[PDB]
Design a binder for this molecule. Structure first.
Ligand code: B12
Ligand code: B12
Ligand SMILES: CC[C@H]1O[C@@H](n2cnc3c(N)ncnc32)[C@H](O)[C@@H]1O
Ligand SMILES: CC[C@H]1O[C@@H](n2cnc3c(N)ncnc32)[C@H](O)[C@@H]1O
Ligand SMILES: [Ca+2]
Ligand SMILES: [Ca+2]
Ligand SMILES: [K+]
Ligand SMILES: [K+]
Ligand SMILES: [N+]
Ligand SMILES: [N+]
Lengths: 179, 552, 136, 554, 136, 178
């Protein structure tokens, strides 16, 4: 238990920030991603990657959807930089940008089993560099053709489980992250 | 302590696969769910007022589209009243003609036809599929890709795949802006290997249509449909946007099909509590309703979802059978990895291979899977000899053939040399003699010299930006020592003028002969009737490497 | 035309003309190389598509025939306009009046009567299913 | 210079397999040879005077035996005049009852039924086989052997195999004189795993009959027949010697079948110019003519011969279909290695697995193939999980089930302890507690302590030389604290007194319930009829290891 | 008997007696340990095999029934003699006279008339096909 | 050509010889076994294994059959010690003894692909040891379950070809080995 709501997420008051938008069960009913990496460690590394680039990290929980693109869209609407990172409980991640169509993105990570804590840190880094209007080399991932069929069914179960915590019409909550 | 028998079994590749127990409430069940609607239809003055228990007041866009366009209302009430077991019996009965069944199955509601095929075991389903397949001749479709988007290698692999027997071939990109090069390389290479092979380059919908309009593809396939309105909407389409896109392709003389497959909706979490097979039936009827001639299904990229649950591979055969029974061409998947086990993936393939479908695989990998840019197929190039051995073992025409190494070397070399002349004539970044040699003898991109990707991408993008069309490729071939390949390329373009290969199951064989369900009608009527592997084609399939001649 | 008339390339090649009134025999390497035929000559006609639609009907495939009839209308619609209408039909892209305006333009500018009715139908049902602009 | 594509393919296991081109003149062709005789028959007052183009004056012993005993002469002329394509259509037509077909197919001559099935592709043959299989319920037969003839391991492996679902299990010996120990261990182990499992110990004919006479087996199967007179003669038998042996087994209350299989005759070099399938049809009719209830075929040990040539694996399915169509129980091979390729051997297995036969394999190896004393099966113990997965994938009952490790450990342990008591009560060389533990957790004989072979052989030979019968095994069990296994062993001996399990396809299920083609009649009539995987049995087949329970999350 | 009478164990277990007139209930663990019953008691009878032959006929399996009829006769033939007759029927092992003497012995000493006829038939055809001693 | 007939085979008179009976095409139409081992190196190892035990090795060529059991049976009737060795062209081999049933044997080697030149020599030793009334241990052979299916079809072809050279009613002919 490392995430506390501190009120409805507000529009960013500064251009030098990235919003990390997490799904409704992240750190709550689910605490690890598809291959057992803890949500606390994932969030720690994404934040650290953002802060390494001298950019502030803000974390919000989205309730209107469990879809990683729509979660990230909720974040990019409020991000002072227009840049957001969406993360589902099973670990799928996207770097999004205000003004892009919802299914478009800056970078998509659509094979959650392949993400390491190193990957999550670099995702934070690249988002912060997008917020500084830079063009970072996209984050690389290690290929594994057996990952998709091996984890697809389990991913769908985890996604269904998280979707049960969607609340229609509920605004995103800003989160405080425990030390 | 531990049983060493069970430690031995724990090591087996199959135990690395993903398996889940059924979750009926959420639609995590392949077929035969107590939540699926009971079949029904009510019609008043030619309008459907109820579809599978749902009143028209509650129709979603999919119900509206299927009820208005996807069901033959002339016999819908008649077939609804028939016993579903009797109808399943008719499907696998050798003496009930396909032409007698099609007016009944195309009048079934989605729940009705699911109920019918759900009475069948896989032997009965295969007995029916060999009859309900639209094209009398079975065929095969290959992936031709590599992780570098190397165009010389794509051309050479496409020529070998065409030489081995694929009648459709498909490429896509590792790097999006390479696409015009991949498409041209696939088309040129395919025509070198066998004039008439149809090619596609699967991309974002707008870019793919543009390459078609420019003459660098022959068909399109990966236009998706989905079985619940939320999933359809979350893909940013409706049945009407997809139907409009389908007619747009035909208006340019390009063959096309949709893509679907079991498990897509529960994978997204919006199965509306229904089985994968019932929702896939809705996808099949959307395809029918749009007037699209065929469908790539059999779970496709969602295969890890039905395969995880009981009767999932049987459901995959069932959704292929529904497609063919609804008088659609079926490009029956077998194109995506789902298991670590050679035993398991063979059993999955044989469901379509043994009876034959319009394309037994919609993407057999004609390259080793490490080069497969659809993230790996159920079969790849290293399986070619096993595939041929099983054809010979069972006397089954799986659409491919054994080939001589010296013929493959020569055809791969010709394709690479033809593409070299295309690139020179069009002022594209050169293909060197060393690259032609490497592509001639390559197994995959590990064997290819690295190209200057920056240059390739700049000139590939300019093909789009400058609207450089397929006649420029014909000209480059004809002026560069390849008037023969030039003529074959021109002949593929002329096929778009006639509309002949827009029809159900169409391929182009022999000397520019279109072969579709219209003129290659499946006339199966039991043993010694319908398509039979025999004559010269059987001699071709018999002639595998390693067969010792007793006269030596 | 009937199934016995298929394939057109075998049974009736002379029936196949292009949008610019070329014939199949005009498309030779010699004519390509001299630019006597060009890419703008190489377009299937509505006449060919309506013939194929008749063949599809005779083959028992009425819905495939309707697709080809829509396609026959769309031969007259420019490439960029094809993509605009496709995009306009995606959920939440268009208002109802924008879709009705596309249909009136299809009908009056291109005589694309069937496609026009198809778009008006989408507009009507997008109202009921909340798939118009502002509904998301 | 070499294509690297072809260098990659040259490394594939399938290219280690043996392939040959057809040699029609010598019979090296699986089926559809132009040398096979055209079907014909003439009958005079119930006597055949002509058979498939041969007048009776020219009959060999096989012709005579088949003509006198192996054809339903009442309808032979009627079925001969029927069109073979129509008959092949009837075979796979779901709406032509097995009970309407059997009087016609049993009336066909060998050449006639071969012509009929040769019109069929493998899909049609499987469609027919699910109808023509004699027993409604499909089943499975296992090999239980090891390279050491370790009896403790045999008992444990046999118990695990019965627990997994084999209804027949088969042992043989690496060392001939071990045979009585192998047989007893297989019988005791099988009864511990599931009472009713039938056991055989395949040996030279006289020794095997003697062990049956002593009560240490339940049935016999490896009594061969052959399809040409020279090959039959060179096996040192005739149809009459084999038919006498068959009745001799039944006179002792023992179920039995013959063994045959495509390719045996051309392998010996005396095919008389005929296809493998035609000669195998002669073998099938010899079995019918003898009054033998069933047959092990599908090439069996000769599988390297039909598999080397075109349509050989189709011909193997065809010979199984002919067997079932002649109203014989079919134990349909899948019991001998023929390929280095997992893809290829899976295709070969599915021909029988998908429709179901009386025994889908006549010797699935219930041990790793290194312990298989038939030189390796088409499937072995390390395939168990793949087999169960495919059952679940396709909703096909292949006769086996997933099982819990703790149940197998307990069932193997009990079998080893039960055999230990038998050896101690009969005064045989002891089975130590250490051996009981090793057998409990073993994968194969690499895990077993080595025994005193000289000593075991000595007491094994005394079992036959002193005619120590199965009642002594019963005694030792009841006296050594295994009253339940003793009772089960007695019940299987009592089954030999009723004759019930002598019938076509008989197995023993549940609580001593004989299940044969007589009371488990296959009544297939298309979709939703006949044997269907459903109910508790489907729940059993669903329950594979590794299936994630969604209730584990949240 | 008919298929309705099968299995004998379930439908008519009292119809089953052994060669020493024991019943199925006589075979208990107690009697095996008491040696009230022994291996010589546990032998299927010709009566049981002829019942099963009738059931095989009623199930449409005439040749199976005939095998059971032969078996019923061979119940009376000692184990060693069974093996002797089997070996004598192997090719080149016997003269025509020896097979005829086996048949007469079968018939006169065991009342095994069907087996005797079976052996005489072999003798006749072994002459025709040269499978008697001295023919190899 | 390394084998030469020298007339009809004589019968052994004293228990001082083991007869090597080969097939009608051994060293003639065929010169190698199922896996290429030459017939010269095969026949050399067997003779060397026999003469190593102090026994005289006599080579004959049977014509009445290509069956290894029947080829060997023809050899044990002419062997002075009653011990013979039958060898087909494809390399299958058996150690037979006069008086045994034709299909019975002392030692059988029914997987010719699994036979090395060390086995052909070792076969000659045990066959000589059986002639000396001794009880030698069974000759070992490597185990390979894939060998039977891999070579079954070819070995049937090789057997069919050698059977073509079978002359009915022709007595064995003794040979002279280089
Ligand atoms: C399976 C799959 C699907 C499935 C399931 C989607 C879902 N959300 O449940 C189906 C067929 C339904 C599908 C639909 C779409 N997909 Co898709 N999909 C894949 C595929 C082949 C594999 C992903 C996978 O199995 N990973 C393994 C599992 C264990 O890891 P995971 O982290 O749980 O994976 C999840 C995500 O990949 C997610 N997902 C899948 N597709 C898409 C697309 C987008 C935009 C997003 C945000 C998420 C997403 O679904 C998976 C399961 O929940 C990838 C190909 C690839 N190269 O990765 C394309 C891919 C991710 N899909 C893509 C596209 C374009 C789409 C569609 C927009 C297509 C359309 N026009 O309808 C829709 C979007 C649906 C949506 N709103 O999410 C593109 C994304 C391009 C990009 N970088 O933005 C990809 C990369 C394919 C490609 N090379 O073009 N897809
Ligand atoms: C396939 C096989 C057969 C085939 C082919 C026989 C042939 N002559 O062509 C069939 C089914 C017809 C058969 C018949 C018999 N077989 Co067999 N056979 C086998 C088996 C399973 C495989 C051998 C093989 O394929 N090797 C691979 C090939 C590439 O090598 P190869 O050297 O060319 O093999 C040849 C010999 O093995 C020969 N052969 C096969 N069986 C027999 C039996 C005898 C006595 C002889 C001399 C030769 C012989 O045939 C093979 C091909 O030509 C072996 C088991 C084993 N342990 O090897 C039993 C085996 C060799 N057979 C055996 C027996 C008992 C018999 C029969 C006498 C059975 C019978 N009573 O009918 C007959 C004999 C026929 C004859 N006159 O040769 C026994 C031999 C026991 C012994 N030590 O004497 C063996 C060892 C099996 C066992 N379970 O014990 N057999
Ligand atoms: C990434 C989504 C894409 O995957 C393809 N696809 C693969 N499997 C399926 C499937 N089962 N249903 C729908 N679309 C599918 C299709 O091209 C779609 O646009
Ligand atoms: C070693 C010969 C033995 O192998 C067995 N066998 C295996 N395959 C066949 C077969 N195809 N035909 C006859 N007998 C066979 C049978 O038990 C025979 O006695
Ligand atoms: Ca495809
Ligand atoms: Ca067996
Ligand atoms: K679907
Ligand atoms: K045979
Ligand atoms: N596509
Ligand atoms: N046996």
């Amino acid at each position: 238990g490392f995430l506390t709501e501190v009120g409805e997420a507000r529009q960013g008051t500064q251009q030098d920030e990235v919003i990390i938008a997490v799904g409704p069960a992240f750190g709550l009913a689910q605490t690890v991603n598809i291959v057992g990496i803890p949500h606390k460690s994932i969030l720690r590394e994404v934040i650290a990657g953002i802060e390494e680039e001298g950019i502030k990290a803000r974390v919000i929980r989205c309730f209107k959807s469990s879809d990683v693109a729509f979660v990230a869209v909720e974040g990019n609407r409020l991000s002072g930089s227009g840049i957001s990172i969406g993360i589902q409980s099973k670990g799928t991640t996207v770097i999004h940008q205000q003004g892009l169509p919802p299914l478009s993105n800056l970078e998509l990570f659509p094979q959650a089993p392949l993400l390491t804590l190193e990957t999550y840190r670099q995702i934070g880094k690249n988002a912060a560099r997008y917020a500084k209007r830079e063009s970072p080399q996209p984050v690389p991932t290690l290929n594994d053709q057996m990952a998709r069929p091996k984890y697809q069914a389990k991913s769908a179960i985890l996604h269904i489980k998280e979707t049960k915590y969607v609340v229609t019409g509920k605004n995103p909550q800003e989160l405080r992250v425990a030390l | 302590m531990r049983s060493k028998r069970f430690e031995a079994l724990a090591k087996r590749p199959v135990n690395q696969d993903g398996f889940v127990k059924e979750w009926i409430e959420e639609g995590f069940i392949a077929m035969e769910s107590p939540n699926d609607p009971k079949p029904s239809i009510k019609i008043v003055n030619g309008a459907v007022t109820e579809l599978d228990g749902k009143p028209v007041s509650d129709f979603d866009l999919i119900d509206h589209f299927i009820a208005r366009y996807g069901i033959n209302l002339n016999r819908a009430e008649e077939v609804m009243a028939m016993d579903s077991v009797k109808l399943a019996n008719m499907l696998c009965d050798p003496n009930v003609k396909r032409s007698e069944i099609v007016p009944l199955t195309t009048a079934m509601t989605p729940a009705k036809i699911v109920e019918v095929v759900s009475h069948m075991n896989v032997v009965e389903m295969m007995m029916a599929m060999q009859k309900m397949r639209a094209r009398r001749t079975p065929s095969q479709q290959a992936h031709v890709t590599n992780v570098k988007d190397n165009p010389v290698q794509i051309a050479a692999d496409a020529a070998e795949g065409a030489w081995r027997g694929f009648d459709e071939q498909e490429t896509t990109v590792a790097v999006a802006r390479y696409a015009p090069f991949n498409a041209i390389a696939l088309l040129v290479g395919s025509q070198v290997g066998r004039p008439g092979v149809l090619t596609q380059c699967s991309l974002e919908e707008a870019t793919e249509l543009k390459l078609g309009m420019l003459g660098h593809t022959c068909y399109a396939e990966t236009i998706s449909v989905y079985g619940t309105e939320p999933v359809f909407t979350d893909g940013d389409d409706t049945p009407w946007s997809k139907g409009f896109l389908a007619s747009s392709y035909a208006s340019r003389g390009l063959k096309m099909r949709f893509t679907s497959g079991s498990g897509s909706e529960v994978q997204m979490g919006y199965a509306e509590g229904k089985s994968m097979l019932y929702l896939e039936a809705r996808c099949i009827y959307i395809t029918k309703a749009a007037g699209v001639q065929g469908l790539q299904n059999g779970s496709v990229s969602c295969i890890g979802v039905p395969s995880a649950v009981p009767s999932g591979i049987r459901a995959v055969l069932a959704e292929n059978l529904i497609c063919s029974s609804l008088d659609l061409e079926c490009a029956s998947s077998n194109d995506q990895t789902f298991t670590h086990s050679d035993m398991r993936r063979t059993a999955r393939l044989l469901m379509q291979f043994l009876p034959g479908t319009d394309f037994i695989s919609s993407g057999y990998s004609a390259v080793p899977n490490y080069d497969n840019m659809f993230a790996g197929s159920n079969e790849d190039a290293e399986d070619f000899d096993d595939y041929n051995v099983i054809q010979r073992d069972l006397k089954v025409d799986g659409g491919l053939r054994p080939v001589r190494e010296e013929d493959v070397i020569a055809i791969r070399n010709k394709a690479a040399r033809a593409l070299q002349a295309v690139f020179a004539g069009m002022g594209l970044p050169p293909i060197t003699d060393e690259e032609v040699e490497a592509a001639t003898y390559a197994h995959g991109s590990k064997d290819m010299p690295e190209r200057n990707i920056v240059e390739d991408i700049k000139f590939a993008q300019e093909i789009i930006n400058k609207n450089r069309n397929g006649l420029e490729v014909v000209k480059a071939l004809a002026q560069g020592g390849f008037t023969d390949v030039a003529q074959d390329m021109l002949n593929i373009q002329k096929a778009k003028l006639t509309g002949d290969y827009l029809h159900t199951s169409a391929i182009i064989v022999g000397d520019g002969q279109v072969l579709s369900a219209v003129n290659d009608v499946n006339d199966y009527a039991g043993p010694a009737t319908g398509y039979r592997l025999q004559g010269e084609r059987w001699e071709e399939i018999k002639n595998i490497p390693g067969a010792l001649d007793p006269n030596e | 035309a009937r199934v016995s008339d298929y394939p057109l390339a075998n049974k009736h090649p002379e029936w196949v003309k292009t949008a610019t009134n070329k014939t199949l025999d005009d498309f030779t390497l010699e004519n390509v190389l001299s630019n006597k035929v060009t890419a703008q000559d190489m377009r299937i006609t509505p006449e060919t598509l309506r013939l194929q639609a008749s063949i599809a009907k005779d083959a028992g495939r009425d819905r495939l025939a309707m697709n080809f009839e829509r396609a026959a209308e769309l031969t007259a619609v420019p490439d960029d306009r094809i993509l605009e209408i496709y995009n306009a039909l995606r959920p939440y892209r268009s208002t109802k009046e924008e879709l009705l305006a596309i249909a009136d333009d299809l009908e009056s500018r291109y005589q694309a009567k069937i496609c026009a009715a198809f778009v008006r139908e989408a507009a009507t049902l997008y109202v009921e299913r909340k798939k118009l602009k502002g509904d998301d």
